[PDB]
Design an enzyme around this catalytic site. Structure first.
Site, PDB file in Angstrom:
ATOM      1  CG  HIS A  39      -3.353   7.938   0.919  1.00  0.00           C
ATOM      2  ND1 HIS A  39      -2.422   8.397   1.816  1.00  0.00           N
ATOM      3  CD2 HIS A  39      -2.762   6.865   0.246  1.00  0.00           C
ATOM      4  CE1 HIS A  39      -1.309   7.649   1.717  1.00  0.00           C
ATOM      5  NE2 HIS A  39      -1.517   6.703   0.754  1.00  0.00           N
ATOM      6  CD  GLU A  72      -3.552  11.585   3.935  1.00  0.00           C
ATOM      7  OE1 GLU A  72      -4.479  12.446   3.777  1.00  0.00           O
ATOM      8  OE2 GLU A  72      -3.503  10.471   3.342  1.00  0.00           O
ATOM      9  N   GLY A 110       3.557   1.606  -1.289  1.00  0.00           N
ATOM     10  CA  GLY A 110       3.484   0.322  -0.602  1.00  0.00           C
ATOM     11  C   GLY A 110       3.865   0.454   0.847  1.00  0.00           C
ATOM     12  CB  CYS A 113       1.040   4.939   2.735  1.00  0.00           C
ATOM     13  SG  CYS A 113       1.795   6.399   1.993  1.00  0.00           S
TER      14      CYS A 113
HETATM   15  C1  LIG Z   1       1.414   5.734   0.575  1.00  0.00           C
HETATM   16  O1  LIG Z   1       0.419   5.118   0.176  1.00  0.00           O
HETATM   17  C2  LIG Z   1       2.061   6.550  -0.478  1.00  0.00           C
HETATM   18  C3  LIG Z   1       3.581   6.642  -0.432  1.00  0.00           C
HETATM   19  C4  LIG Z   1       4.431   7.563  -1.361  1.00  0.00           C
HETATM   20  C5  LIG Z   1       4.102   7.444  -2.801  1.00  0.00           C
HETATM   21  C6  LIG Z   1       4.937   8.325  -3.623  1.00  0.00           C
HETATM   22  C7  LIG Z   1       6.405   7.971  -3.471  1.00  0.00           C
HETATM   23  N1  LIG Z   1       6.839   7.818  -2.084  1.00  0.00           N
HETATM   24  C8  LIG Z   1       5.881   7.171  -1.192  1.00  0.00           C
HETATM   25  O2  LIG Z   1       6.238   7.413   0.101  1.00  0.00           O
HETATM   26  N2  LIG Z   1       1.507   7.859  -0.449  1.00  0.00           N
HETATM   27  C9  LIG Z   1       1.082   8.592  -1.576  1.00  0.00           C
HETATM   28  O3  LIG Z   1       1.156   8.167  -2.684  1.00  0.00           O
HETATM   29  C10 LIG Z   1       0.525   9.958  -1.362  1.00  0.00           C
HETATM   30  C11 LIG Z   1      -0.966   9.839  -1.202  1.00  0.00           C
HETATM   31  C12 LIG Z   1      -1.548  11.054  -0.493  1.00  0.00           C
HETATM   32  C13 LIG Z   1      -1.039  11.464   0.688  1.00  0.00           C
HETATM   33  C14 LIG Z   1      -1.578  12.569   1.300  1.00  0.00           C
HETATM   34  C15 LIG Z   1      -2.621  13.239   0.689  1.00  0.00           C
HETATM   35  F1  LIG Z   1      -3.149  14.297   1.242  1.00  0.00           F
HETATM   36  C16 LIG Z   1      -3.120  12.833  -0.488  1.00  0.00           C
HETATM   37  C17 LIG Z   1      -2.598  11.728  -1.093  1.00  0.00           C
HETATM   38  N3  LIG Z   1       0.848  10.648  -2.527  1.00  0.00           N
HETATM   39  C18 LIG Z   1       2.141  11.173  -2.660  1.00  0.00           C
HETATM   40  O4  LIG Z   1       2.973  11.070  -1.791  1.00  0.00           O
HETATM   41  C19 LIG Z   1       2.514  11.871  -3.946  1.00  0.00           C
HETATM   42  C20 LIG Z   1       3.795  11.834  -4.564  1.00  0.00           C
HETATM   43  C21 LIG Z   1       3.619  12.620  -5.745  1.00  0.00           C
HETATM   44  C22 LIG Z   1       4.656  12.919  -6.787  1.00  0.00           C
HETATM   45  O5  LIG Z   1       2.391  13.031  -5.752  1.00  0.00           O
HETATM   46  N4  LIG Z   1       1.731  12.582  -4.711  1.00  0.00           N
END
Ligand SMILES: *C(=O)[C@H](C[C@@H]1CCCNC1=O)NC(=O)[C@H](Cc1ccc(F)cc1)NC(=O)c1cc(C)on1
Length: 181
Positions: free
Chosen positions: A40, A71, A145, A147
């Protein structure tokens, strides 16, 4: 102890503060010029590493044998630098774990250990409309923050953090063959 010694070693030599148009991420240098980022972060032709601009020569977004997103995106950077090869710390197969620490290194979260506890197999995960396979979960309220953070336990590299719900958090399972070529 020996588990965090390893985390330090990895912080210093392989875990990099990175930015893309998608914001801040922790990058794992794997060996040579090969790194991984969570899909992402969408690295373009270029990317900022410790704020300096680095060209991205090639970028593969890893998928299932069934074509499902895993991913993760391997990138090949444009440098004269070798990352110390840590593929030998990545298991052959996606490995669950016990007292894991999540290693984060971004501008906003520099040199950071997060004690996420045990890491259990999860599998299929649909986060925001977008499916992922081979994910694992830890019971920790992970956040924006973090990821790209590196999941480690007992000297093994098992995961790259990719999502959470405000209570649990989810990583992309790492296995050595991914870093093959
Ligand atoms: C890293 O950038 C980030 C970390 C998450 C955000 C949410 C709260 N906890 C943290 O660990 N990741 C994301 O935001 C993730 C993005 C993503 C990941 C895989 C994918 F196939 C597409 C997009 N989005 C989420 O985890 C998320 C949480 C909710 C609610 O909706 N989406």
């Amino acid at each position: 102890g020996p588990s965090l010694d390893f985390a330090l070693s990895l912080l210093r030599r392989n875990v990099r503060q990175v930015q893309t148009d998608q914001g801040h991420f922790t990058m794992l240098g794997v060996r040579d010029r090969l790194a991984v980022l969570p899909r992402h972060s969408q690295p373009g032709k270029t990317i900022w590493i410790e704020h300096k601009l680095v060209n991205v020569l090639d970028a593969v977004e890893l998928v299932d044998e069934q074509g499902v997103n895993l991913e993760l995106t391997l990138i090949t950077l444009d440098t004269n630098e070798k990352f110390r090869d840590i593929t030998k710390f990545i298991p052959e197969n996606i490995s669950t774990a016990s007292d894991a620490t999540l290693v984060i290194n971004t501008e906003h979260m520099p040199s950071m250990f997060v004690p996420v506890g045990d890491v259990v197999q999860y599998g299929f995960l649909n986060l925001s409309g977008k499916p992922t396979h081979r994910t694992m979960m830890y019971n920790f309220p992970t956040k924006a923050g973090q990821c790209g953070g590196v999941v480690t336990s007992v000297g093994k590299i098992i995961g790259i953090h990719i999502g959470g719900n405000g209570r649990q958090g989810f990583c992309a399972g790492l296995k050595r063959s991914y870093f093959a070529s």
